[PDB]
Structure formats: C-alpha cells, structure tokens
C-alpha cells in the first residue's frame, strides 16, 4: 500500500515500475514474462533485468529502514546433482554501489539476504526449507517472501510469518539506491532457473500485520490453483494429491471400476541428504467443463481420467444410504443411475492451493450429495476414493480444517520437479 518506492508490475507486454517514482526498467530478451505477473530468470547471459532507481527522490538513510517483498518459485534439486545444489551459492538480485548495498542469494534450499555497509561490514539472514520432507510446502511451489530492515534487525517472513531474524545493530550506512540487477550469477547448471512475481521495495520496516495483509491480497484470485500455485486449467493432465492423506494416491483397482488408495513410493537411493514422495503417480486426471481454460470457484466440471488412451469419468451412485461410498470409475455415459456433475469449491478463507469437489444432482439443484474424499472401508481394512456426506458439516466449521480428506490438489508435470531414477 503506502511507503512503496518500487513496484514492478506487468503492463502491455512489459515490466514497469508503477510506484510513481518512474524507475527505469530494462528487461533483456532472455527473461520470459507473462500477464500473470510471472517472470523467469534462466542461466542465459541475456536473462536479466536492470532497474535504475530515481536517485533524486529515493535517499539512503543514516540507519536502515526498508523492506523488500516478492513471490518466488525455486525448482527441486536434480537427484544426480544433489551436492552441487547443496554447495553452490548464486546471486539472483544484486543492488550495490561503491561496494555497499544488498543482495538476494540462493544456496540450494536456502534463500539469503545480505547487507554491506559503507565501512565494508556485512550481515546476513537466511530462510532454509527442509529437503527430507515426504511432501514439501516450499520446493518448486510459489511462496511469499518479505525481508525487513531497521537499525536493530533484518527479518525474513515466509507466507506472512516470521522465520528468521539477524541482529544488525553494528551495521551503519547502507547505499541502497544503486542499480538493481536481476540475474542468476555464480556456478549454476545450464538448467538452473528461478520464477518471481510482484517484486516491490518499501522505504519503511514493514510490520508483521502489514505483511500478513499483503500475503492475503496477493494470494487472492477468482480462479483455483494447482499444487505448484499456478492457475488451475481445464483440459490439462493432473495427478491428484490429498492434503489429509499426503502419502496416498488413487489407482484404478484391477478388474474393478473403483479407485483404490495406495502409498506413495519415495526416493529409492540411500543418499541421506534428501527424501521425497513421488508426485507423478496414480491416474492421470483431467478436468472438463460441463457447459479461457481457467477453472474458477463454483464452476461445474466433469472429473475425468485416462485409462490408457480412453477417457473415463468419476461418478457417484444415486442410491447410497451409508455416510460414505466408493466412487464409480468408468467410461463416459449418460446413465441416469449415477451423478456425474461436480462443483469445484474453495471453502478455505485463508490462502491455500487445496480445493474441494462437491457432487450435485444437476447445475440448478440446491441439494448437496457430498464431497469427494478418502475413506477406510472394512471388508480387511482398505482405503478407497469415495464420496462422503460427513464432510458437508465439517467444511462449515471455522477455522477451516486444512487436513480434511476432502482437500485435493492437482499436480501437473513441471520442469522444476523431476523424480526419474
């Protein structure tokens, strides 16, 4: 909102400063830029942005009082290049003049903020996310960063919450109105890249409150999101993730038109530096419109999947007495003994990449059959892709329960997540 001295935003096929201070912004040819305000820095020498701050109005203060915010998406390590990922630090944003200033740096799974004052004194603060989680909230997924500086503290906030704090009471004058160079710099593979959006600078130390608000505003969209935080799309192959059953995936049971639930395979080598669960497993689903290709809250869809090259569909049986029942997975058909219409929902009021899938009788029927989920059926105990009436009450309970088994995320293949072995 207020105190914004740089505000890099997409406009008319270009990246511009909308702060009102009219910084000069030069995007070189190697930066990929789109109207979702996303830009990509690659390993190419022409993949850079030069921002020249207006030297007159912006001023270096005696003591630090300034903040930087942006969204970032950092690809997964390569399994065959773990050590290079762990060890090789590369600058992504550099803002120096007369050997003083600031930079943003990455070393594998660590993001690093660094200050150098006019006397050559340096201080750093970093945020590092775990690379041994079954399912990471951070790896190759859009998240929100804010760094704040005053005379006492450099802090990093992730997704609105304080993560790191360095004492910088020994830091004196920092020259912070130098050229800002957005460019990958250091010992990086040909393949390395970074995505960023909504890069902004403030001439104050932002409050936690101010940052949390910014997180929510910038999180907002009418459209739903995929697992990576990109817009959810019609007519796109997606694997399915369950936020309440993180390690579970859907597979058509052999010679039976139901979806059994199996346990995700993991990274199969012994390498004690990393661990992850495979994401590109289970049926390949695809969302179709019932009636752009962006999925919005309240849209009516078919949830389909590929059985070899045939396109099958997810149904609920019209007659079900129990609280929970298995879904029917079968060819596209008009049969009036099964509901085929789903309304995609977003019941969470906080930022999320999860959505819910609500079965209805038709597009105008006010009645609600239930939400798609996972349930343990006693036959042997065994988990199945299901519909459940039970979620209908749960989804109204505030605050919204993040870990309900009715919470789904859609995972497309992405160049920033490889898991071949």
């Amino acid at each position: 909102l207020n105190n914004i001295i740089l505000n890099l935003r997409y406009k008319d096929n270009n990246l511009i400063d909308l702060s009102g201070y009219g910084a000069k912004v030069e995007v070189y040819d190697g930066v990929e830029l789109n109207d979702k305000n996303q830009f990509k820095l690659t390993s190419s020498a022409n993949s850079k942005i030069r921002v020249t701050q207006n030297q007159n109005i912006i001023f270096n203060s005696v003591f630090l009082d300034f903040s930087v915010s942006f969204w970032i998406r950092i690809p997964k390590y390569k399994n065959d290049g773990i050590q290079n990922y762990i060890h090789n630090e590369y600058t992504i944003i550099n803002c120096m003049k007369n050997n003083s200033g600031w930079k943003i740096s990455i070393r594998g799974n660590r993001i690093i903020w660094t200050l150098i004052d006019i006397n050559g004194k340096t201080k750093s603060v970093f945020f590092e996310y775990n690379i041994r989680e079954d399912i990471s909230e951070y790896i190759n997924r859009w998240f929100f960063v804010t760094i704040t500086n005053n005379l006492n503290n450099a802090k990093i906030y992730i997704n609105g919450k304080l993560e790191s704090n360095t004492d910088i009471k020994d830091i004196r004058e920092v020259i912070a109105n130098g050229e800002i160079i957005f460019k990958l710099d250091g010992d990086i593979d040909r393949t390395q890249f970074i995505w960023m959006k909504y890069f902004s600078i403030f001439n104050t130390e932002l409050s936690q409150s101010n940052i949390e608000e910014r997180y929510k505003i910038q999180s907002y969209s009418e459209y739903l999101k995929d697992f990576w935080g990109n817009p959810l799309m019609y007519n796109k192959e997606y694997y399915m993730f369950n936020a309440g059953n993180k390690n579970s995936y859907i597979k058509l049971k052999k010679d039976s038109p139901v979806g059994e639930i199996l346990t995700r395979s993991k990274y199969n080598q012994n390498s004690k530096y990393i661990n992850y669960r495979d994401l590109y497993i289970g049926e390949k689903f695809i969302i179709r419109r019932k009636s752009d290709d962006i999925v919005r809250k309240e849209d009516y869809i078919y949830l389909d999947f590929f059985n070899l090259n045939q396109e099958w569909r997810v149904y609920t049986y019209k007659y079900f007495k129990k609280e929970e029942e298995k879904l029917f997975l079968a060819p596209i058909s008009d049969s009036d003994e099964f509901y085929n219409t789903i309304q995609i929902k977003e019941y969470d009021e906080q930022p999320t990449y999860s959505c819910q899938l609500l079965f209805k009788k038709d597009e105008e029927s006010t009645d609600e059959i239930g939400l798609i989920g996972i349930h343990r059926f006693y036959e042997e105990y065994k988990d199945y892709f299901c519909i459940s009436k039970w979620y209908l009450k749960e989804v109204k309970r505030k605050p919204y329960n993040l870990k309900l088994g009715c919470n789904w995320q859609f995972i497309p293949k992405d160049e920033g997540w490889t898991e071949l072995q």
Binding site: D255, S256, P257, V258, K326, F328, A330, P331, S333, S335
Partner: peptide
C-alpha cells in the same frame, strides 16, 4: 456395453 458390465462389478463393490 463396457459401462453396464462395469456397473455389475460396482454393485459387488457396493456390497449389494
């Protein structure tokens, strides 16, 4: 057709 034959399997799954 495939659909009605699968429906029969599904009825076993329902425990009907």
């Amino acid at each position: 057709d495939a659909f009605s034959k699968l429906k029969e399997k599904f009825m076993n799954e329902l425990h009907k």
